[PDB]
Design an enzyme around this catalytic site. Structure first.
Site, PDB file in Angstrom:
ATOM      1  N   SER A 159       0.811  -1.218   0.000  1.00 30.66           N
ATOM      2  CA  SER A 159       0.000   0.000   0.000  1.00 30.66           C
ATOM      3  C   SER A 159       0.850   1.276   0.000  1.00 30.66           C
ATOM      4  CB  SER A 159      -0.939  -0.033   1.210  1.00 30.66           C
ATOM      5  OG  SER A 159      -2.100   0.734   0.954  1.00 30.66           O
TER       6      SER A 159
ATOM      7  N   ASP B 171      -7.305  -5.786  -6.608  1.00 27.47           N
ATOM      8  CA  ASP B 171      -6.881  -4.854  -5.578  1.00 27.47           C
ATOM      9  C   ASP B 171      -7.153  -3.410  -5.982  1.00 27.47           C
ATOM     10  OD1 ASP B 171      -3.813  -4.577  -3.559  1.00 27.47           O
ATOM     11  OD2 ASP B 171      -5.702  -3.496  -3.445  1.00 27.47           O
TER      12      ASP B 171
ATOM     13  N   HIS C 282      -7.008  -6.412  -1.344  1.00 28.73           N
ATOM     14  CA  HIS C 282      -5.834  -5.617  -1.052  1.00 28.73           C
ATOM     15  C   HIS C 282      -5.143  -6.172   0.182  1.00 28.73           C
ATOM     16  CE1 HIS C 282      -3.156  -2.214  -1.045  1.00 28.73           C
ATOM     17  NE2 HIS C 282      -3.473  -1.933   0.204  1.00 28.73           N
TER      18      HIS C 282
END
Ligand SMILES: *[C@@H]1O[C@H](CO)[C@@H](O)[C@H](O)[C@H]1NC(C)=O
Ligand SMILES: *[C@@H]1O[C@H](CO)[C@@H](O)[C@H](O)[C@H]1NC(C)=O
Ligand SMILES: CCOC(=O)CC(C)=O
Lengths: 269, 269
Positions: free
Chosen positions: B146, B201, B258
């Site tokens: 991320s 994602d 994710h």
């Protein structure tokens, strides 16, 4: 090791338990098709499983869950979700036993749980009976994780002996009473209780036995690690009330292990 | 499909990323082993890996992560934590670019990423270089998930070409900038960059091309289910700047996908 058929059964209901947290049905209309966010309940979706009755925070125990009809597996399922803050719920957890003999001679159960179910039991027990009638050849099952585990056991022991068998699959459920009750749930007819524990999980260890609590037999203990997949060769059926060498060991506990019952549970991605 | 070796490298750094979250790092003695809670980084623990420098909220964007020494795999790892709350982070994501010609010409990378990194590059580069020295033989690797993977592709091309090679493993990282910058990483040397993506994602789909952003090449895309294990066959290589076929397709992004790169990541049980 346990049978594959039993393995499949345990996996399917660990997923029904899970859905109690991750299905979008807090107010969903009865009739919709059950679904989960974050791949929490795939075997459940694959099936023609729909909501019959959803429910939230009900009466005195703040109780949530749903009642489903599974036409693929021929099931009438009642699911009890657990706390939305299990780490809390754990810290606040009194070990107070209230007596309950309406259920069984001499049986002492946890005050908290027993109190919460009893305060909702009618409006629901009717609802099961409704479908049992609507689908007489369908098996009735109750399941739940953590707290919801505790409940469904209770609701289970409390509603059988009425016409149809009631099976109970609890996941990481805690102790619910005294050696009397342990025994009542260990032998009682009109159904079978499947008490599943994972590794050291910290709830199947509370309240403590020191406090008069005991665990019904038997115990299906998952040996596999947290986040590890579960195979039928990773479960050991453990015999004898309060046996050790299963979840009940003197070693140090864990909170994640709680959230991993055949997949992610007690939380949603 | 990747080789077994690459796979192990992908799994290893996916776990070093998770460790930026689920480790009990904070600030803890340099030289202490690395461990994560909830089996978030078994392979890392399994390795003779210790902290070299921990940082909590360093500078402008409260940058968080750690610098590890791994004598088992001979690595100097710099792992960048992502946001403490990824929903709120995605929501408020600012989309403004800012020049960074001192990394490359005509290079504009996301404003706040580059700016947070900048503040620390001096305290940080100094620790890397310091470790590179004692352990000249050791391979330096930057990794993250991320906002964490982002910050690692940016300390990536900034600190590269300075004697040592810098490999970058990114797990579901967002676009870090404009195309002049896209093309650069795609074929810079003295360090390969593996940009990894999982099914749908949502984060590697931001910022969008619309706001002037480009994704480099190639793309290692895990196509296996969320919460499903990853085998070597579930990883596909995807070439062409801002290509499509991996994560960059036209369908609804999922936040859950994710959180599943090999092992639960960006959240701790
Ligand atoms: C319900 O599930 C059935 C398949 O069992 C599907 O054909 C139908 O379209 C679904 N309807 C809704 C509202 O989900
Ligand atoms: C940490 O790991 C190293 C090697 O893996 C070992 O020698 C050391 O005893 C460990 N220390 C602790 C506290 O685990
Ligand atoms: C150790 C903290 O874990 C939890 O309480 C998990 C949860 C969201 O219920």
């Amino acid at each position: 090791e346990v049978s594959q058929d039993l393995f499949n059964q345990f996996n399917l209901f660990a997923q029904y338990s899970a859905a109690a947290y991750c299905g979008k049905n807090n107010d969903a209309p009865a009739g919709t098709n059950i679904t989960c966010t974050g791949n929490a309940c795939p075997e459940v979706e694959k099936a023609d499983a729909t909501f019959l009755y959803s429910f939230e925070d009900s009466g005195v125990g703040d109780v949530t869950g749903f009642l489903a009809l599974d036409n693929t597996n021929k099931l009438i399922v009642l699911s009890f979700r657990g706390s939305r803050s299990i780490e809390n719920w754990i810290g606040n957890l009194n070990f107070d036993l209230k007596e309950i003999n309406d259920i069984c001679s001499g049986c002492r159960g946890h005050d908290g749980f027993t109190s919460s179910w009893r305060s909702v039991a009618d409006t629901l027990r009717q609802k099961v009976e409704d479908a049992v009638r609507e689908h007489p050849d369908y098996r009735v099952v109750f399941t739940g994780h953590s707290l919801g585990g505790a409940l469904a056991t209770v609701a289970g022991a409390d509603l059988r002996g009425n016409g149809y068998d009631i099976d109970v699959f609890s996941y990481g459920a805690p102790r619910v009473g005294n050696r009397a009750f342990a025994e009542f749930l260990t032998v009682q007819t009109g159904g079978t209780l499947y008490r599943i524990t994972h590794t050291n999980d910290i709830v199947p260890r509370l309240p403590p036995r020191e406090f008069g609590y005991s665990h019904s037999s038997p115990e299906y203990w998952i040996k596999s690690g947290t986040l590890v997949p579960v195979t039928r060769n990773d479960i050991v059926k453990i015999e004898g009330i309060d046996a050790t060498g299963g979840n009940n060991q003197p070693n140090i506990p864990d909170i994640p292990a709680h959230l991993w019952y055949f997949g992610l549970i007690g939380t949603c991605l």
